Design an enzyme around this catalytic site. Structure first.
Site, PDB file in Angstrom:
ATOM      1  N   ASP A 169       0.933  -1.176  -0.051  1.00  0.00           N
ATOM      2  CA  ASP A 169       0.021  -0.141  -0.094  1.00  0.00           C
ATOM      3  C   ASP A 169       0.908   1.410  -0.047  1.00  0.00           C
ATOM      4  O   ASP A 169       1.594   1.250   0.576  1.00  0.00           O
ATOM      5  CB  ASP A 169      -0.881  -0.053   1.215  1.00  0.00           C
ATOM      6  N   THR A 210      -6.626   3.603  -2.141  1.00  0.00           N
ATOM      7  CA  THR A 210      -6.435   2.154  -1.782  1.00  0.00           C
ATOM      8  C   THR A 210      -7.613   1.131  -2.397  1.00  0.00           C
ATOM      9  O   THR A 210      -7.366   0.425  -3.182  1.00  0.00           O
ATOM     10  CB  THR A 210      -6.283   1.923  -0.303  1.00  0.00           C
TER      11      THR A 210
END
Ligand SMILES: *[C@@H]1O[C@H](CO)[C@@H](O[C@@H]2O[C@H](CO)[C@@H](O[C@@H]3O[C@H](CO[C@H]4O[C@H](CO[C@H]5O[C@H](CO)[C@@H](O)[C@H](O)[C@@H]5O[C@H]5O[C@H](CO)[C@@H](O)[C@H](O)[C@@H]5O)[C@@H](O)[C@H](O[C@H]5O[C@H](CO)[C@@H](O)[C@H](O)[C@@H]5O[C@H]5O[C@H](CO)[C@@H](O)[C@H](O)[C@@H]5O)[C@@H]4O)[C@@H](O)[C@H](O[C@H]4O[C@H](CO)[C@@H](O)[C@H](O)[C@@H]4O)[C@@H]3O)[C@H](O)[C@H]2NC(C)=O)[C@H](O)[C@H]1NC(C)=O
Ligand SMILES: C[C@H](CCC(=O)NCCNC(=O)OCc1cc(Cl)cc(Cl)c1)[C@H]1CC[C@H]2[C@@H]3[C@@H](O)C[C@@H]4C[C@H](O)CC[C@]4(C)[C@H]3CC[C@]12C
Ligand SMILES: [Ca+2]
Ligand code: NA
Ligand SMILES: [Zn+2]
Ligand SMILES: [Zn+2]
Length: 777
Positions: free
Chosen positions: A116, A154
């Site tokens: 991430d 995300t």
């Protein structure tokens, strides 16, 4: 009851009975002794010298006993510390020509290692910080970067990775979103996200399971530490044939968190990157212990990058709007505006856009109605996407008012921004060896992951075959779609006296002007091929204009003026019926609508040839504001591009997309016409500009690879988008075009046409060419 012998089951057991799977924590459904039995920490996650050949103590996190390998519950470093093995990272690079799996394995497993906020430029730090990731990258197949989807958040990107779909299709359009039909909001924090109704498409695990391929993991309860997740994957990989999954996923929330706190270039980013590497090493050591390090395909993939963004660089909507208490803003690196209350009569999108447009000189965002966003973003066809949108400049935020730093980094910006770019590595038998591939879009990976698992992909937005050059063995060979509508080749039929269009004025073609073959029409329609000296076109009798107009401009071709005795010259096309032609009286009556031409009269090869440009069949409806953009393109820029690229081939045409789904409109879907007429008004105008990648060879005799750039200019009656449009076109038009850059494949969706049918290049190579995007970064 209890989790004994059930820790990390591959099954959610029936309510009301307690669960022991990798998600039980997220549903508050675990048995009382899950933490005791299944989440052991004792003595860490690494074997030590003194622990070698120990008696099995059940309460250790991982084991260093003799029987550990038999079970598949050793620590990852057991063989290294005890059996004198080397870490995977310390072994030389070695080509995996075939999968070297244990006896029972039917396919190479796929493990997706997702990170991430992992920025593409972090890979430059190399072996010094990340030796395991640097080996994977160097030894397997990698790109310089991978393009995420917008918004570069995300959840939109992760679920795009899982489905091959644009956020507008899969329905996770943001980390935060509101759905007017549900009357509910979706957030990181909440129960709402646990409802399946938010999640559309078909993720890879559902595709796998539907076709009898067993699917692990993907979502993990956040309370389960990284080391335990890796050990559980290794434990699952030791299961018997009839139980073992062929697809796994690991997610690291780093280096996003440290990116957000310290910024992307902060020296504090190193330890987090070392931490990721350590986890990758634990996986690879683990695989190498189970004799799977030359069996499994590993994808190391990021979801988006990270930019320098501080709270001092914030724009406040209260400095523009007089009543910000009447709106809701989804804030940050993008903006989405909506009425605070649905029953406010005073709310009105038009006034809001007006008030947010080109007000301050330095202004660090730009408002759009969603239909007017660059079509390359594909961010409009979902009821959860607010009509009003704000594209925020890189390094900036937008907030509703001052009382809405704790953060030095953020992301979410336009997916063409350099800082938003992220990583891709593919390692394993099926991937290529020591191979660099060009950058590509994350929408393409779902197909590739289906191919690595021998699955038929569900309908998606990747171009299947466009990434065959990433793979050693391609299970998918693409094929050209069949043409649906045959063109007509009408002769000289009608007299000039047969036309009362209200207009006033005073062979070798194909091989020269269609360098890459005639485009194929992939829907039922009636169109005519029209030859001229300087250009060829596929003229529609339904829409009364070209579907496409193709021509070639060499490096030494001249730019001539439009002689002013032909300023309002429009000539009837003898080869086309008056009933299937435009008329100039519509244009006269329509006070808001002028017209323009697809083949430029400015680049005519001769004076006599220049007359063909003024045919009614080359004419297209244009707003005067838009004619500034188009006329500057045709007159100045096309020559510029021919010079710099050693000639260029240009295919230009209209697009109709009134319902903003990125797909070709049918007739009913057209909602605007030239007044008192059947002439349909395009929403956009495209051009595809091709040349030889080797610029030393001219465009018309290219023996090698091709080079493409395209755009989809919106057909706007103003230039409010361009805040320097009061100035000369040299100041603003080219910037406007670059912002609306496109892939050829975008144009094919929007036109129902298929290009590059006659080339000397493989079709897989052409599919790569069609997915390319010139970003101007
Ligand atoms: C990017 O790629 C996308 C996928 O290829 C393209 O999007 C597709 O666009 C088409 C054309 O508009 C659209 O087709 C319409 O579908 C209507 C039915 O809608 C519901 O069902 C479908 C199909 O179910 C399954 O198939 C999809 C693959 O598309 C798969 O991902 C699903 O998991 C599901 O799989 C199961 O079935 C298949 C097939 O048998 C099996 O193989 C598989 O094993 C499974 O068992 C769903 O896709 C729809 O999903 C939408 O709606 C739900 C609920 O609201 C949302 O959660 C979800 O996110 C999604 O929302 C998006 O799409 C809708 C429109 O579909 C938008 O309004 C919305 O804003 C979102 O963007 C539904 O559950 C059908 O009625 C309709 O029929 C009409 O047209 C036909 C001619 O085509 C006429 O004959 C009729 O007269 C009708 O008027 C039409 O067929 C697809 O639904 C859509 N699919 C997806 C996944 O988005 C997209 O265009 C492309 N983009 C670009 C730029 O190229
Ligand atoms: C949202 C929530 C998970 C909470 C979280 O932040 N977890 C971080 C760990 N994520 C992870 O490991 O994801 C890996 C990954 C990688 C890639 Cl490349 C792509 C993706 Cl999409 C993911 C989870 C927990 C439970 C989830 C629901 C599930 O139990 C049931 C449904 C399954 C279906 O396929 C989608 C919709 C669900 C309702 C799931 C939604 C997300 C939930 C709530
Ligand atoms: Ca459309
Ligand atoms: Na006019
Ligand atoms: Zn993220
Ligand atoms: Zn983040």
């Amino acid at each position: 009851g209890s989790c004994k012998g059930r820790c990390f089951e591959l099954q959610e057991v029936g309510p009301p009975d307690c669960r022991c799977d990798n998600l039980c924590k997220s549903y508050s459904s675990c048995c009382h002794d899950f933490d005791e039995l299944c989440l052991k920490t004792a003595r860490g996650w690494e074997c030590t010298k003194d622990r070698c050949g120990e008696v099995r103590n059940e309460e250790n996190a991982c084991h260093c006993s003799e029987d550990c390998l038999s079970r598949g519950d050793c620590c990852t470093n057991y063989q290294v510390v005890c059996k004198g093995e080397s870490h995977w990272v310390d072994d030389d690079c070695e080509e995996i020509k075939v999968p070297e799996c244990p006896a029972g394995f039917v396919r190479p497993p796929l493990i997706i290692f997702s990170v991430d906020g992992f920025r593409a430029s972090y890979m430059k730090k190399g072996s010094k910080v990340m030796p395991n990731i640097e080996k994977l990258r160097s030894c397997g197949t990698h790109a310089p970067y991978m393009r995420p989807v917008y918004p570069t958040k995300t959840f939109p990107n992760l679920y795009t990775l899982a489905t091959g779909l644009y956020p507008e299709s899969h329905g996770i359009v943001g980390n935060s979103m509101y759905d007017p039909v549900f009357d509910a909001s979706f957030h990181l924090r909440g129960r709402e996200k646990f409802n399946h109704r938010w999640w559309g498409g078909q993720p890879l695990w559902i595709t796998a399971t539907k076709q009898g391929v067993r699917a692990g993991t993907f979502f993990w309860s956040v309370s389960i530490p990284h080391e335990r997740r890796i050990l559980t994957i290794l434990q699952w990989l030791s299961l018997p044939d009839n139980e073992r999954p062929s697809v796994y996923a690991f997610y690291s929330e780093q280096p996003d968190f440290s990116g957000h706190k310290y910024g992307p270039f902060g020296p504090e980013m190193t330890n987090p990157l070392r931490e990721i590497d350590k986890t990758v090493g634990q996986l690879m050591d683990g695989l190498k212990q189970l004799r799977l390090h030359r069996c499994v395909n590993v994808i190391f993939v990021g979801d988006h990058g990270m930019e320098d963004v501080t709270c001092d660089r914030t724009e406040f909507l209260s400095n523009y709007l007089t009543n910000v208490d009447d709106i809701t803003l989804v804030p940050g690196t993008l903006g989405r505006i909506r009425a605070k209350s649905i029953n406010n009569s005073k709310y009105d999108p038009k006034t809001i856009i007006a008030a947010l447009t080109c007000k301050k000189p330095d202004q660090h965002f730009k408002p759009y109605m969603k239909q007017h966003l660059p079509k390359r973003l594909h961010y409009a066809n979902n009821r959860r996407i607010e009509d009003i949108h704000l594209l925020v400049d890189r390094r900036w935020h937008v907030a509703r008012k001052p009382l809405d730093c704790f953060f030095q980094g953020d992301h979410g910006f336009d997916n063409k921004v350099n800082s938003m770019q992220t990583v891709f590595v593919g390692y394993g038998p099926t991937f290529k060896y020591r191979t660099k591939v060009p950058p590509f879009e994350n929408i393409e990976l779902y197909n590739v992951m289906c191919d690595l698992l021998g699955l038929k992909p569900a309908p998606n937005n990747g171009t299947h075959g466009s990434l065959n050059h990433l793979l050693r063995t391609n299970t998918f060979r693409p094929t050209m779609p069949d043409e649906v509508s045959r063109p007509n080749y009408p002769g000289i039929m009608y007299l000039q006296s047969e036309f009362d269009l209200g207009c006033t004025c005073d062979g070798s073609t194909k091989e020269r002007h269609l360098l890459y073959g005639r485009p194929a029409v992939l829907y039922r329609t009636s169109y005519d091929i029209l030859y001229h000296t300087d250009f060829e076109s596929g003229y529609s009798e339904i829409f009364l204009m070209p579907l496409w107009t193709s021509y070639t401009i060499s490096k030494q071709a001249e730019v001539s003026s439009i002689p002013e005795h032909l300023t309002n010259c429009v000539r009837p096309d003898v080869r086309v019926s008056p009933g299937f032609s435009q008329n100039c009286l519509a244009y006269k009556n329509d006070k808001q609508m002028s017209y323009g031409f697809l083949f430029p009269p400015y680049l005519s090869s001769s004076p006599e040839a220049k007359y063909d440009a003024f045919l009614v069949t080359n004419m297209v409806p244009m707003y005067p504001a838009f004619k500034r953009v188009w006329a500057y393109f045709q007159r100045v820029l096309v020559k510029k591009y021919a010079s710099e690229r050693n000639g260029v081939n240009v295919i230009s045409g209209p697009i109709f997309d009134y319902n903003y789904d990125g797909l070709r409109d049918t007739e009913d879907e057209i909602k605007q016409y030239v007044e008192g007429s059947s002439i349909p008004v395009p929403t956009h105008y495209y051009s595809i500009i091709t040349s030889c990648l080797d610029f030393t060879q001219p465009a018309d005799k290219c023996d090698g690879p091709l080079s493409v750039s395209s755009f989809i200019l919106p057909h706007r009656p103003d230039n409010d988008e361009s805040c320097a449009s009061s100035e000369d076109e040299s100041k603003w038009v080219e910037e406007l075009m670059k912002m609306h850059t496109a892939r050829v494949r975008d144009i094919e969706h929007l036109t129902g046409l298929d290009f590059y049918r006659k080339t000397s290049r493989s079709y897989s190579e052409i599919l790569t060419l069609k997915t390319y995007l010139h970003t101007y970064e």
